[PDB]
Amino acid sequence: PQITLWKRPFVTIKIGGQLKEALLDTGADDTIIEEMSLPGRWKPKIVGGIGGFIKVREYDQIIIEIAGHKAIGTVLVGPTPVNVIGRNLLTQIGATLNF
Amino acid sequence: PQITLWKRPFVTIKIGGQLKEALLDTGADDTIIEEMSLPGRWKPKIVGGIGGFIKVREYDQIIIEIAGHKAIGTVLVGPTPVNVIGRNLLTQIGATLNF
Numbered sequence: 001p002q003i004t005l006w007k008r009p010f011v012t013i014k015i016g017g018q019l020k021e022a023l024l025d026t027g028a029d030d031t032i033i034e035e036m037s038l039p040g041r042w043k044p045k046i047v048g049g050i051g052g053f054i055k056v057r058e059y060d061q062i063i064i065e066i067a068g069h070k071a072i073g074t075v076l077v078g079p080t081p082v083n084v085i086g087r088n089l090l091t092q093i094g095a096t097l098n099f
Numbered sequence: 100p101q102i103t104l105w106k107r108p109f110v111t112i113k114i115g116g117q118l119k120e121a122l123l124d125t126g127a128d129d130t131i132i133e134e135m136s137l138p139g140r141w142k143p144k145i146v147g148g149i150g151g152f153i154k155v156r157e158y159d160q161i162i163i164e165i166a167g168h169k170a171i172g173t174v175l176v177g178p179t180p181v182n183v184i185g186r187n188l189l190t191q192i193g194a195t196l197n198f
């Protein structure tokens with residue numbers, strides 16, 4: 001699709017068998033989701049931005065369907081105020097910024 | 100242009116006659132730049148990112164060029180880790196997300 005930016009670009013994602021709303025975020029290196037269960041090993045990570053840093057769990061090789069497009073990559077789980085789809089998965093669904 | 104997301108989407112901006120690097124950030128409502136001198140009066144704003152909230156200075160009707168595209172709009176100044184071009188100016192230069 002072509003998504004304009006008059007409002008926050010939220011889409012529906014499917015992850016870990018759950019449906020969630022998440023923000024298509026070109027300023028995010030990584031993908032971070034609110035607290036949820038994911039399968040496999042995880043490692044601790046600290047990520048930061050406006051306001052400071054937060055502690056998350058890093059899960060690798062996770063599949064997320066993003067607005068109907070499947071991908072696989074790392075997903076961070078932690079106290080993010082908003083679910084965010086970052087560049088690591090945006091590249092995989094073929095997303096670009098155009099002007 | 101068409102900007103891919105394999106690396107951080109930095110572009111060169113011009114503001115106050117000076118060239119700076121700034122991140123094109125669809126996850127940001129607003130545009131926020133590192134401490135610099137801007138003309139006119141400012142108003143207080145609180146913005147909230149991944150790690151909490153921060154206090155910034157809001158300057159209105161600021162002349163800014165984004166990858167050669169001329170814009171005039173609201174610019175926030177505050178302790179941002181990097182310069183961020185948010186949706187208020189992305190919309191003005193006609194940027195969309197496409198996949």
Ligand SMILES: COc1cccc2cc(C(=O)N[C@H](C(=O)N[C@@H](Cc3ccccc3)[C@H](O)C(=O)N3CSC(C)(C)[C@H]3C(=O)NCc3c(C)cccc3C)[C@H]3CCOC3)oc12
Pocket residue numbers: 023025026027028029030031032047048049050076081082084086122124125126127128129130131146147148149151180181183185
């Ligand atoms: C409490 O906070 C909020 C609550 C509810 C809604 C919103 C919306 C916004 C918003 O747009 N916030 C902007 C923002 O910081 N947005 C960020 C995303 C976000 C959106 C909503 C809530 C929280 C974060 C930005 O797009 C980004 O990824 N930034 C801005 S600063 C940055 C370039 C380093 C990067 C970053 O945070 N990276 C951290 C990060 C993430 C998110 C994922 C994976 C790895 C890392 C390191 C600021 C910046 C200028 O306008 C206001 O905040 C909210």
